[PDB]
Amino acid sequence: LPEPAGDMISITEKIYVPKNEYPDYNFVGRILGPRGMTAKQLEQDTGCKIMVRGKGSMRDKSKESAHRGKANWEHLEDDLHVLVQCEDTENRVHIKLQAALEQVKKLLIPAPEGTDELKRKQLMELAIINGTYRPMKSPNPA
RNA sequence: CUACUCAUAU
Description:
With 142 residues, the chain is an alpha+beta fold. It has helices at residues 27-32, 37-45, 93-107, 117-129; strands at 8-16, 49-53, 81-89. The record marks 26, 49, 53, 119, 122 as: Involved in RNA binding.
């Protein structure tokens, strides 16, 4: 990285999810991961702040909101999107911003089921965390 | 064994 500039800068980028090509995919679960752990690993590695929401944050479950209590995203009238905030000097705020949005885009391009182990391995640990895991079964055992 | 993941935030 280059040397610091004269003052601290702050900026953010807004990038919508390409879910119009993956209408059966759940990006909010892929970017945040189990218990939000993947959201915390991304924001510490890129040094940028992660933000994700859309019509996936709806509370149509009538007994559930899946977004932890109340929120401030207005009437959630917006589609699935990603936001990435960064703050540094005029010489480093851009390098970290561009690197952070590089990680999100590669997560907006997942693969079909049985070909994307990066989300199947998150679901195994999610199932140890809530205690609902299953060992599965197969015919003609032993 | 692909358990569907909810972390942040004007």
